[PDB]
Structure formats: C-alpha cells, structure tokens
Design a protein around this ligand. Structure first.
Ligand SMILES: O=c1ccn([C@@H]2O[C@H](COP(=O)(O)OP(=O)(O)O)[C@@H](O)[C@H]2O)c(=O)[nH]1
Length: 277
C-alpha cells in the first residue's frame, strides 16, 4: 500500500519556512538543504546540473546523517505533512518522489526534526501566496547589515537586477560552474575559506552547495544554502502564477540553461572576486 507509506513518512517532522528561519537566527546556524536532486544523486542518478559522482553521493549521505544542532540545520522537503499547502502538480511530484524513495526515506531520516528545504522556495508552488511577503522579509533579515560572500554559478546571478540583497553592507562573489561544480570542489572550498573572513556565506550551487556548507561549518563558518531563492523572488516580485522563464539569468527548473541573454551588470562584475572553472 503506497498510501500506508505516505502515512508512515508523515512521522518525519519539518519546521516550516518561518519556523526554520527562527531556528537559524536564534542559533546563528549554517543551513544545508536536501531536495529531490540530492536524493536522486545519493541513490545513483544524474540530475540536470550535476552528473552522478560517487564521492559526492557519499558525502551527501554523511551530511544527511548529521543531527541538526546549534551549528547546522539539516533540511528536508516540507511535504510529509500538510501537503495541501501546495498546488496539485507539486503535490503529485512530491508524493511520487517520496514513494519512489520509500527505501531511502524510511531509513535515512530519523532525526527528531529537520529544517525546511523550502526556505529557498517560498512562493511559486504555494496555493496561498499571502505569507510570501512575510517569508521574504524574514529571509532578508538574515543578511541585512552583513558583509556577504556569495558562492554561486555563472548563470545564478542571485539578486542581480533585483533588490533582494540591497541591505547587505557588501557583496563578494565566487563564481563557479553553472553545472558540474563538484568537479572543482577542492578549489571552491579553498577559495571560499580565503574570502570568508568576517563574512556570512550564502551558497547557491546545487548538490555541491551541501558539501561546501558542511565543510565550512566544520571549519567554523556560518554558511547558508539558499539554492534557487533568486528565481522565487523574481517570480514573487512579478506576481507570477506559474514558473515563467527569466531571460537574463538561470531560472529554477529550466536547468539546461538554454535561451539565456546575459547582460553586463557592472555592479555584479565588481562584486566578483574570482571565477572557478
Ligand atoms: O553545479 C551547479 C549546480 C547548480 N548551480 C546553481 O545552484 C542553484 C540551485 O541550487 P539548489 O539545487 O540547491 O536549489 P533549490 O531548488 O533546492 O533551491 C542555481 O542557482 C543553479 O544555477 C550551479 O551554479 N552549479
């Protein structure tokens, strides 16, 4: 009975977006998020912007086994209870996902609580988009007045052309490959450490981001895996009802990165400390 499995998995306890944010701020915690692509990778599959890699899969598994505490919040998709928050397409996607990974989800995740992987996904799949403004305003309090190090891909351009990070005191960016970043992992970690002094680190880098956040946290940094936050903010700012493609940068779930018409944004260019790849 697949239904039986659905009920059993509702034993997994995720702190919803706003509650996750309170945990993060109260504890100054790093944040690592596991989504469908991470489970795909951990179980042996390649995903649109990251080929399967055995070392990556192993690290992801180790990280998911780490208990959430004062230093790190480990997050899962917030779909195990109150699935009715999400639109029909999203509900179907996620149920098929966690049923397909019954073997995995049944044995992987018996921590007392997890954060929400959807702290980066606060808008587009919701039926009631009313709390979204509150979600983004709470997110923004993470970086208001902070010096940021943003580690992201060449097409991510997080906050470029919008006001998401306007209140950050400064931004430096380590710009990595838009796909298959794990290939360059050692260099990414090395340069992130070098540039992280007195900065809050934000990471938008697919599966590679999870390892980076974990390794940085072990070395004593606060690093926050924010994934596709920019896409959701862009959709939110334009009052989108569906996932419309952005023309000037990467768009979540258009992960082949086709049809992009880049611009030269001087402010963005001046923030770039180095490119990897
Ligand atoms: O090798 C990679 C893998 C992904 N990304 C970027 O990682 C972000 C999405 O990360 P994640 O999959 O964690 O997002 P989520 O959907 O879970 O929020 C996007 O900006 C992608 O462009 C990247 O730059 N290089």
């Amino acid at each position: 009975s697949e239904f039986a499995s659905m009920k059993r998995l509702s034993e997994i306890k995720v702190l919803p977006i706003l509650e996750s944010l309170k945990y993060i701020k109260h504890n100054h915690a790093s944040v690592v998020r596991f989504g469908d692509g991470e489970i795909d990778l951990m179980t042996g599959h390649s995903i649109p912007y990251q080929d399967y890699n055995e070392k990556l899969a192993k690290r992801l598994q180790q990280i998911l086994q780490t208990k959430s505490d004062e230093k790190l919040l480990v997050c899962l998709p917030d779909v195990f209870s109150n699935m009715d928050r999400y639109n029909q397409n999203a509900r179907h996607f996620w149920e098929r996902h966690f049923l397909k990974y019954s073997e995995f989800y049944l044995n992987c995740c018996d921590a007392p609580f997890y954060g929400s992987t959807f702290i980066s996904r606060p808008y587009i799949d919701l039926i009631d988009k009313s709390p979204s403004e509150a979600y983004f305003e709470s997110l923004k309090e993470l970086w208001r007045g902070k010096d940021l190090l943003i580690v992201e891909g060449a097409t991510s351009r997080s906050g470029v052309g919008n006001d998401l990070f306007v209140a950050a005191s400064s931004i430096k960016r380590l710009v990595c490959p838009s796909k298959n970043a794990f290939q360059y992992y050692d260099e990414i970690l090395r340069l992130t450490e070098k540039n992280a002094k007195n900065r809050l680190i934000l990471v938008m880098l697919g599966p590679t981001a999870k390892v980076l956040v974990a390794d940085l946290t072990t070395k004593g940094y606060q690093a926050i895996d924010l994934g596709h936050i920019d896409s959701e903010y862009e959709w939110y700012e334009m009052g989108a009802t569906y996932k419309v493609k952005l023309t000037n940068k990467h768009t979540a779930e258009f992960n082949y990165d086709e049809g992009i018409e880049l611009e030269f944004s001087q402010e963005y260019q001046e923030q770039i400390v180095a490119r990897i790849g």
